[PDB]
């Protein structure tokens, strides 16, 4: 029993062909089943013919025979069809509104999430339909994870390097950081979890959370989890106030957080606020000055990944009292300097999936770009706050979309908060970049910040760009550009100091080859987000949409604090770069 996701009318009908089994009113269920291939409908009892050895499950081909559902073949003389009169027979038939258009629901329910239009519709439909679309997309991703074959340790070459035998008849998932596996050991009549692992091509080099002496028999599977159903909206209704509501500012503040003080007051002006912080602008500084500006307020700091929550905890250790901070860890090594699992603490640092059902004065959700509507909705469901502070950057990386193959996802379609801060603009903005040199700041501000981001540092004269296509070779799930790595080698020989730089590439295979040949530390642009280095050497390695993405390029080029070398294969981004052009040797 439930409420029609399209009508909110109390209903006992669920669609059996939809993976999330959403609740639908009689009229909505009728229109959906007659407009798609979805013919299985669930009630308190499923709408299926109960005849012995009969397979008729279509709702339009079933009748109420006596006390059961029967097909036309097996029905008694006294029967009336399940699907008739423009409605579906079921509970609360009199109370039913229906919908003029079921196109959005039909598209969301029947889409395979392989087109950018599906995500656009998900981010632009009704709020209940947004929740349903997030549920469907996450469940589809979880199921698609099960489609991958099992990789078993066939022989151990050495430590940190393995040999894998893959399951026959099933595809092999890409071996990168986005696909974190889990090891499993063989026992008598059961199976035991031995750690979470990631794999790369060597033979496979494996990086595990915990070290082991694993041998033949252990096999690695991408762990999937149950998708709980969403109830709260991705965003609470917007309320604007005339006075600081529920907060009491401190009368003494330091110069470290003075510049944000006005923005802090804006936190009290509205139910929720959106913050756009470019790289190196002090998003953590703002988030912790919010607490220092309202010392009595109980604040919950949340982020999708453990890394961002750990960074928030690191900042809190720097400015906030340790006894007022508690890190919530569910039953991966994370921050372990706060007291563990203390819900009632004034400052509560926790990831999205491990949050407790609680209230707070302020809920600060960091790194909004990585978030999905699922995370936003579940955060609103578990946390009750007078004020919400969404912190991130639409110009940075979103959550990866494995099922998306056709089309590219724009920043406005990353999530509801992303939609707001891309359409109506962020509630407040961090306009000073303290990390990157002037060239990089100007480049990113002209690219994705509408020439608003300003440079704290001067020009470092160490920002260089080179236009070099090279040769692109493709392996199972990545791309390699050896001539670009050779150009980097020549640059390193002519500029030995740049050997302190960190190589960054959008492809894991290019990173592996660069680590093997150059000796530099290597980072994917996806994993480089949130970090910073003095010198950065970046090779585009392709001209595909993945490497030419403006958010990805911004993240890649904002990792440098002093100097950056850019080997560009795309002419558009190379010309966009405000760097000193270099000639190919």
């Amino acid at each position: 029993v439930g409420a029609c996701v399209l009508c909110n009318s109390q209903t006992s009908l669920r669609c059996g062909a939809c993976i999330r089994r959403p609740f639908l009113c009689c009229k909505c269920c009728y229109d959906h089943v007659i407009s798609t291939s979805h013919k299985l409908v669930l009630s308190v009892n499923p709408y299926v013919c109960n005849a012995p050895g009969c397979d008729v499950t279509d709702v339009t081909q079933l009748y109420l025979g006596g006390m059961s559902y029967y097909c036309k073949s097996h029905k008694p003389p006294i029967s009336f069809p399940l699907c008739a009169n423009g409605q579906v027979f079921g509970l609360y038939k009199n109370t039913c509104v229906g919908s003029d258009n079921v196109t959005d629901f039909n598209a969301i329910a029947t889409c395979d999430w392989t087109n950018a239009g599906d995500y656009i519709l998900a981010n632009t439909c009704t709020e209940r339909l947004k929740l349903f679309a997030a549920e469907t997309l996450k469940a589809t991703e979880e199921t698609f994870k099960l489609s991958y074959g099992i990789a078993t340790v066939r022989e151990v070459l050495s430590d940190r390097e393995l040999h894998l035998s893959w399951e026959v008849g099933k595809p092999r998932p890409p071996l990168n950081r986005n696909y974190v596996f889990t090891g499993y050991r063989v026992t008598k009549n059961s199976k035991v979890q031995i750690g979470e692992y990631t794999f790369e091509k060597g033979a496979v080099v494996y990086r595990g959370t915990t070290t082991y002496k694993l041998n033949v028999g252990d096999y690695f599977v991408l762990t999937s989890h149950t998708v709980m159903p969403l109830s709260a909206p991705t965003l609470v209704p917007q309320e604007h106030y005339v006075r600081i509501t529920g907060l009491y500012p401190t009368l003494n503040i330091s110069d470290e957080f003075s510049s944000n003080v006005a923005n802090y007051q804006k936190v009290g002006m509205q139910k929720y606020s959106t913050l756009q912080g470019p790289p190196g602008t002090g998003k953590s500084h703002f988030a912790i000055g919010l607490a220092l500006y309202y010392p009595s307020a109980r604040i919950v700091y949340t982020a999708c990944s453990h890394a961002a929550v750990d960074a928030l905890c690191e900042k809190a250790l720097k400015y906030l009292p340790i006894d007022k901070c508690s890190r919530i860890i569910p039953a991966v090594e994370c921050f372990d300097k706060f007291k563990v699992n203390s819900t009632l603490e004034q400052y509560v640092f926790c990831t999205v999936n491990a949050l407790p059902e609680t209230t707070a004065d302020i809920v600060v959700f960091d790194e909004i770009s990585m978030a999905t509507n699922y995370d936003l909705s579940v955060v609103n469901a578990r946390l009750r706050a007078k004020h919400y502070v969404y912190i991130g950057d639409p110009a940075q990386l979103p959550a990866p979309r494995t099922l998306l193959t056709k089309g590219t996802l724009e920043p406005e379609y990353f999530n509801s908060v992303c939609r707001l801060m891309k359409t109506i603009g962020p509630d407040m903005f961090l306009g000073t970049c303290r990390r990157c040199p002037a060239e990089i700041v100007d480049t990113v501000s002209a690219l994705v910040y509408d020439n608003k981001l300003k440079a704290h540092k001067d020009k470092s004269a160490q920002c260089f760009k080179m236009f070099y296509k090279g040769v692109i070779t493709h392996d199972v799930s990545s791309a390699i550009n050896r001539p670009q790595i050779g150009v980097v080698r020549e640059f390193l020989t002519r500029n030995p100091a740049w050997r302190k730089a960190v190589f960054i590439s959008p492809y894991n295979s290019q990173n592996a080859v660069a680590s093997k040949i150059l000796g530099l530390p290597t980072q994917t642009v996806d994993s480089s987000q949130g970090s910073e280095y003095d010198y950065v050497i970046f090779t585009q390695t392709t001209e595909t949409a993945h490497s030419c993405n403006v958010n990805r390029f911004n993240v890649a080029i904002t990792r440098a604090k002093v100097g950056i070398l850019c080997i560009m294969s795309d002419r558009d981004l190379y010309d966009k770069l405000q760097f000193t052009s270099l000639e190919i040797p």
């Binding site: 006992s12 009630s43 109420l64 006596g66 009336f80 509970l91």
Partner: protein, 49 residues
């Protein structure tokens, strides 16, 4: 003919409605007692010392 075909149908439809209603009610009570029993066991175990 076509009226004795109908006025005898709302009776069986109404009783089917009532039946699956009480079946849903009983099923909900089933979940309720499941939750109560499990929480009672987990509360009584915590005293084990």
């Amino acid at each position: 003919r076509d009226a004795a075909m109908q006025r005898k149908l709302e009776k069986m439809a109404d009783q089917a409605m009532t039946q699956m209603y009480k079946q849903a009610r009983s099923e909900d009570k089933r979940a309720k007692v499941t939750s109560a029993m499990q929480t009672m066991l987990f509360t009584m175990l915590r005293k084990l010392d």
